[PDB]
Paper text:
IpCa enters the vestibule of the channel and binds deep at the cytosolic side, adjacent to the transmembrane region. All RyR1 residues involved in binding are located in the cytosolic extensions of the inner S6 helices (S6ext) that line the permeation pathway. Equivalent residues of all four RyR1 subunits make different interactions with IpCa. The most extensive interface includes the side of IpCa that contains the 22–30 loop. At the “bottom” tip of the 22–30 loop in IpCa, Thr26 is located in a small pocket formed by two adjacent S6ext helices from neighboring subunits, making extensive van der Waals interactions and a possible H-bond with Asp4938. For example, Arg23 is conserved in all calcins and forms a likely salt bridge with RyR1 residue Asp4945. Superposition based on the pore-forming domains shows that the S6ext helices move laterally to accommodate IpCa but to different extents. These movements can be described as bending of the S6ext helices with a hinge point near Gly4941. The degree of bending is the largest for chain A (~10°). The one with the largest minimum radius (“exit 1”) is lined by IpCa residues Asp13, Arg23, and Lys30, and RyR1 residues Asp4938, Glu4942, Arg4944, Asp4945, and Glu4948, located within S6ext of different subunits, with a minimum radius of ~2.3 Å.
Author numbering:
A (entry chain B): 1 to 33
B (entry chain A): 4208 to 4251, 4323 to 4344, 4549 to 4587, 4626 to 4745, 4769 to 4969
C (entry chain D): 4208 to 4253, 4323 to 4345, 4541 to 4587, 4626 to 4744, 4769 to 4969
D (entry chain G): 4208 to 4253, 4323 to 4345, 4541 to 4587, 4626 to 4743, 4766 to 4968
E (entry chain J): 4208 to 4253, 4323 to 4345, 4541 to 4587, 4626 to 4692, 4696 to 4742, 4767 to 4969
Write the structure that this text describes.
Amino acid sequence: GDCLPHLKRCKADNDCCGKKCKRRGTNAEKRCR
Amino acid sequence: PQVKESKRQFIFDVVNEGGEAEKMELFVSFCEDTIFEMQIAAQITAREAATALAALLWAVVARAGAVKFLNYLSRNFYTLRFLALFLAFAINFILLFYKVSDSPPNMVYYFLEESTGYMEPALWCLSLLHTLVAFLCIIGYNCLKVPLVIFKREKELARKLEFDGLYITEQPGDDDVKGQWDRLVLNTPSFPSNYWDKFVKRKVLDKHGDIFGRERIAELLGMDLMSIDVKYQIWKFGVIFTDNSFLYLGWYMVMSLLGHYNNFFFAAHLLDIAMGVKTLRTILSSVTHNGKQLVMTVGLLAVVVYLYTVVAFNFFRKFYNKSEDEDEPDMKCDDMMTCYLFHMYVGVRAGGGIGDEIEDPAGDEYELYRVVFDITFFFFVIVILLAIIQGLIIDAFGELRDQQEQVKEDMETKCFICGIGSDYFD
Amino acid sequence: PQVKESKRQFIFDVVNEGGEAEKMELFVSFCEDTIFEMQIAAQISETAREAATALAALLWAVVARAGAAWGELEVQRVKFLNYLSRNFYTLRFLALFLAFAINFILLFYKVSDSPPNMVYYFLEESTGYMEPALWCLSLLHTLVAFLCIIGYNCLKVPLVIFKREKELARKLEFDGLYITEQPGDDDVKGQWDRLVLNTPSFPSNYWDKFVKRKVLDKHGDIFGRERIAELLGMDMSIDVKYQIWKFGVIFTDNSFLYLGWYMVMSLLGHYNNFFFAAHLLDIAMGVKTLRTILSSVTHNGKQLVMTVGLLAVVVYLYTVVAFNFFRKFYNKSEDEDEPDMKCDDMMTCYLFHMYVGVRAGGGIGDEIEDPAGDEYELYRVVFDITFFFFVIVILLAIIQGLIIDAFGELRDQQEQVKEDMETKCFICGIGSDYFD
Amino acid sequence: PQVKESKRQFIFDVVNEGGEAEKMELFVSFCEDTIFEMQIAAQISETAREAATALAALLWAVVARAGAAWGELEVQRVKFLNYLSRNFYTLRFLALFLAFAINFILLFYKVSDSPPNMVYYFLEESTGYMEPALWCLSLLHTLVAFLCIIGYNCLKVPLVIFKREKELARKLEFDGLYITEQPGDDDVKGQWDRLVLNTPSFPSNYWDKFVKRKVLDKHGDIFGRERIAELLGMTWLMSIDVKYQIWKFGVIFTDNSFLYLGWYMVMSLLGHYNNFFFAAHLLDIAMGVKTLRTILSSVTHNGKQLVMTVGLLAVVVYLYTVVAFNFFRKFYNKSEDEDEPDMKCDDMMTCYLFHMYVGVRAGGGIGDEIEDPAGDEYELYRVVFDITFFFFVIVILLAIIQGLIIDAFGELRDQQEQVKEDMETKCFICGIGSDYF
Amino acid sequence: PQVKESKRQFIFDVVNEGGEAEKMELFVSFCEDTIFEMQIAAQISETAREAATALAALLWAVVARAGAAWGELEVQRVKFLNYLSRNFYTLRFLALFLAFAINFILLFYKVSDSPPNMVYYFLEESTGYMEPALWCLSLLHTLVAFLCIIGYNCLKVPLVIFKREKELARKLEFDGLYITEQPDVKGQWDRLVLNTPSFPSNYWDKFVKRKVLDKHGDIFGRERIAELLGWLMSIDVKYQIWKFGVIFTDNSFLYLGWYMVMSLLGHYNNFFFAAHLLDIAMGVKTLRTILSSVTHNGKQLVMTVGLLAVVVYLYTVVAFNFFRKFYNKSEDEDEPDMKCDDMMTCYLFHMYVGVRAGGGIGDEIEDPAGDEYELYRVVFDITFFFFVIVILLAIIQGLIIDAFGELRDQQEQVKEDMETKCFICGIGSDYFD
Ligand SMILES: Nc1ncnc2c1ncn2[C@@H]1O[C@H](COP(=O)(O)OP(=O)(O)OP(=O)(O)O)[C@@H](O)[C@H]1O
Ligand SMILES: Nc1ncnc2c1ncn2[C@@H]1O[C@H](COP(=O)(O)OP(=O)(O)OP(=O)(O)O)[C@@H](O)[C@H]1O
Ligand SMILES: Nc1ncnc2c1ncn2[C@@H]1O[C@H](COP(=O)(O)OP(=O)(O)OP(=O)(O)O)[C@@H](O)[C@H]1O
Ligand SMILES: Nc1ncnc2c1ncn2[C@@H]1O[C@H](COP(=O)(O)OP(=O)(O)OP(=O)(O)O)[C@@H](O)[C@H]1O
Ligand SMILES: Cn1c(=O)c2c(ncn2C)n(C)c1=O
Ligand SMILES: Cn1c(=O)c2c(ncn2C)n(C)c1=O
Ligand SMILES: Cn1c(=O)c2c(ncn2C)n(C)c1=O
């Protein structure tokens, strides 16, 4: 539930298993990189 | 037709920043502002290439991100702004053919036209039409959007006076600029000019008319017993000249007026395209999104450059001779101010450190010391501080663009007026 | 084989953009298209030289291993067609090899005034074996491209026609797009498919030849039967409207347009043998990485163009300030008697600012003379610093990101699709946890 | 004031660390530290000139906005201490202002051969009362630094020594550290705390004075009572115990903040000799605000990996230096004049220095500085050498060092944001957040 | 010792690329290796000078603090072999110290025409102890390289031998890769071992021949399978050549052999010893990660470099057809330098100088302001800069950094998986506490 896949789109920091929701540069899409 | 944009702005705002606890109140405020929005509508060579890119840019701008004496002027205000933008683009395009020469038409600003002698009269007519359309836009704004903002201000004042009773009991004039300004409208007999409730004074004189003297509230709010509401007039002037959009339109009008003194003043009107399209506005606002951190980083860079400058001033003084001629030298570090200017101006923009310009330390004392000096300067400035400054703005712009996508996703994912997701709705 | 690649593209599209509501419908449509290709496949069944050579061989190897693509007359004509269509991918590979060989040969070109005006002749390392090799390779590549055009027309074009007829008929009998409503403007297909109604050969590829009867029976009560009969045209063997519609639909196809562009460039390669450099770009369309890199630029095209426009207006606002206030430092010449003032007209100053200043990387003040012991020193310093910090730090980085991030997002989407298919059943949303 | 900052620091420490089992113990420790802070607070309670001026004023304003906040002798002695300790942050603000003014005045220095060897003198368009202004400002800066050291001795030193005695007593009682084992290797604090036991005033500021009695009673059977008493130690000049005083000075010196303030003071005294050592005082603004402190700490966050990457770059350049020294040596003629040429790689040391200092900073590789191989042999070899060098340094190694520092800065910001968000969606006692209410 | 390193490595791969389905089988294989490792262990058991010196000392200290760790004649020889077997990581660290020492010595190399042809002379700051010392540490480096390769052969070769025995025996008695099918250079190479009189020299199942023969004794006859499976007197030539070949196949053995070869070649030319400083990358994990980041996305990097070469070739042909008169680099009018008079020369100029320029190819080429084709050349230069420097170089750099960061994140994820979940039981650490 709270945990999210690796490259699946996230919304904010943490709130996934990766815990690090960084964005690539100017990209809007954020994922648990 | 026009209230749709206000609706989009409202919903985007509430999803982006509006909390869940005040969503109903924000909907109520939006609906109250929206009912009378319908009543307002009911009452209403290099030349060829330069031309090619100019036409392409105009096409891209147009495609994405574009009682009757005020009737036709009110519905066409949005098109009037596009017409003004077209005139600004045209005059900017004609401004690219300027030249300077000493011969008669003291440097002079004249025109170089390929047998097109109708260019200067065209520019004059375009400037006149541009100032005329700016005047028309500033005339239409006070009748199109000013009533909405003054009605919102009256709404918030009425809510404060009724539910909170700030003016009679709290009386916070000194604390805020608005509190001082709103004191004048209370005594005016024409307070509910735009507000639907014309009897907002008969409610608060019995809501708080027992603990506090009624004779004080009656005089405070103008309760008594051609038509010149002076205090309401100055209040209206204050709110309209304090408005951000009104201030921007007034700045545009004054720039258009100043453009008659010199046509080059019209170049400032090219910034209207930035506000027209969302992404250019995002680019502009990314700098100010992290303004405090950006200014602090710039200050840290400045003090680091100052430390490097004083270190050079004490020791590496003879290495700052820019002039190649031995008879006449150009000493850039003979003064702390000049050395600091050279370090901030040339060293930061060098891209490889301050040492690319100043003399080679080979074959002289302080050789390895200066090698370390320039290595540290390069690493600490260009590798670190400039990269961090660029990255802060890049991340701010990326997150600002991401915010709109997230707003759309929450729009299409969960029920806004129910709070439940679409998984159950299906 | 072909079905495997088709299913890969279909699943990639469904996972990326296909919604879950219509996922089963997309599967049904793909199965409908896949079965039609089965019978299509059934009917076709029965020193600088050494370094340059080494580098070209390595590049060819890596690009090849990365995934690079009258009774007697009648029986002979079809046999050649199936033979050609069986090895269309090998024909693409041969065309790529021919293009690479010609481009490598083109590197051994020297230009000089004297014959072997300017004369472009070939100079080899005492090997005259390349002069006729180029000509033979040119005609071989032209013939290969011709056969490739014919094979693509015979193999994949019928699938496109079948699909187009499929959606056309489906809309006709399930939505009334033509009789109950009108597609209107802004849709070229809406007006283009109007020419096929009266053609008796409408279900040439589709298996349902009674679609007209069903749509006549369905709308025969709401609308007059004569109207349906006139609209659908129900009453040597050469027709015009169907052929024109077929020509329009093939010219609309992107792959056929690309192959025709290749063919016309092959023809243009005979006017001058040095025109064949355009054929070297087929490597990008073969390997997925370069295709994704190319699509990265187009992914954010509107944002890219509008950011470049913002850069242009910023450079214009800077150029006007440079023109009016400080233009005496714009002398790029070293001779006092011969000036090279780059800011004397608005057009030339704008050109100098955009073409030189942007590419400088350290600001416009690098080329402009330093205002050390003259007036406006602080103004010029602020001007240069702000120009650099805007143009080369913020805006240029934004333009670069609008492509680098786009490429990265495309890669992340591909990996996400791969992981989603690897860890989730396609038919049912059950994850790998319960299904294990 | 102080208590709010201490609370914020506590939350940052606990949430950043991630510890959950020890959360309650940390809360109780903060509670007792807070009671100590309240008790001590109650005890102490009652032209280029114009542009440069504008820029300095703007910088000072922005730094202020964020990052700034004999019987009769007995009463006077404590009144001075109370008044000085009351406004420690005001003293720090005054020190920052004094340093900023001193640096602004120092920004107008000149050198010349003739008197007003090389002599340093001050010039100003009129404004003849700026050099005396600096003369007074140096004295005020030294005085304010002395006040700052006194205020830090009064504010936090008792807190630090009380905390140290607290963990010492806790380890002695709960763990029995000293009577059952020895710190042995490492444990600098544990080894330094040895002299405390013999001092009679172990709980000088700790509340309970019976800690030694508790230790002796608890661990008096397995271990000898006489040994425990000997280990535990069982005219104000004579009554003062030396060992406790040495412990106090050791703990005070070991503290990082006191070391920083002492360095500030010693730089203040050293400034009077050269008048240019006050530039080091501008680094105080970095520690004043969270942003610059995080920026500075991001460099040392990945120090080991940064050193690894720097060493890899150095050894990579060393191989390129060797290759250039053995093969490509005629291309390193920097001097344009043929009569007097110079070879960068005539010796290995100067060749390595040229490759490291110039090649890395070039941004386009080492090939830009050296002579191009246009009409000479080894042209392909030189081209490959330059291309590989430029790639391997600029695209990979320099990008990776910059990458590490920038990523550290980003994470240090992401962790702060995550801590702030977690404190909004957590109760800090029960694992529920805004979902429950 | 080595068992801890083996355990950590096994965990690293078994969590990085090992699924839960075969995790138990991989663990069983690791415990099979571990017993052999314990048997092996039981068997072996009973001025610029000062700055450069400071920098070298600091670098060596930080590197060392983070990585790099006649019957009587026969009785003496076996003890000597055991002595080398016991200490191998220490010899590998001594060799690394010696390489750094001799490289620091080589840093003081000078060349001059006159004797102390172009001769090379050593500069000594009135210390004659250095020139003989160079030869001394060269000899010790060669000796320790020989000791290291002997130790690796003694203590690590049986591990790979017994692992390959596991693999081939398990393939034989489960799948029958050589009787029911046919293979894959390893299969062709190990095939000679099958007919050997003593196949399982290093494995427990010394009677596996009968098991394999009886397992498929009905599909194939006894004689059909018997032929397939079959000092000086005990010289098993096929088995010994198979052992030599699998030893050669080992990557670490190849690394040790390359080290020995470089050490031996360093006597012929003293500057060949500089290749021994690459061992620091293997010593510390992060340098190995940085090195492997380049090859992590090798195929995509090669494709991107090929695209860059193709686009540079396109710009070269565009310039060659039209913009060639502006490529006069030589300032002298009498002697011009035509860089685009030949296609190969112009392509080399574009590839070598255009990419490294940083501001596009237009910086080197002459300004077209005072000539025709000005707008065309301006567009050419701007498009070249934007397409090459802004796009392709940034893509390559971003790919490298992404691969590096992905490797770091994989290591971190492996660590968190170890600390957050039990290896055998799928339950997490929350259940335990
Ligand atoms: N209370 C709501 N009213 C309308 N739409 C809502 C509401 N809550 C969420 N939505 C979402 O907003 C979207 C509807 O779009 P909207 O109401 O803005 O229409 P529109 O953009 O003006 O119309 P159109 O798409 O037809 O041009 C859907 O994704 C829907 O799920
Ligand atoms: N309903 C499904 N039907 C088929 N495959 C499915 C389904 N759900 C998930 N998959 C996954 O799709 C893949 C099936 O594709 P296929 O057998 O062609 O091989 P692949 O995994 O794509 O790899 P490769 O073709 O390189 O061997 C498997 O990874 C399988 O786990
Ligand atoms: N158990 C808790 N104890 C303290 N704060 C809690 C707790 N649970 C949730 N919070 C929340 O954590 C935050 C801590 O509040 P605190 O008083 O430290 O804020 P502050 O940073 O001083 O700001 P402000 O004065 O503007 O609220 C608040 O938002 C509070 O609602
Ligand atoms: N079955 C298991 N047995 C042991 N440790 C396990 C097991 N499953 C998971 N682990 C994890 O492996 C780690 C074992 O300790 P770790 O490798 O971190 O180093 P250590 O405790 O310092 O000692 P050592 O490296 O000597 O084992 C712990 O994080 C533990 O949670
Ligand atoms: C008359 N009137 C309004 O005109 C009105 C309103 N709420 C909003 N509006 C606009 N209410 C409650 C109302 O009574
Ligand atoms: C002949 N035929 C098909 O070939 C066919 C089909 N549905 C799908 N296909 C492919 N139907 C209904 C059909 O009658
Ligand atoms: C000695 N030994 C083992 O150590 C062993 C084994 N099977 C598994 N192992 C681990 N066999 C058969 C065996 O003889």
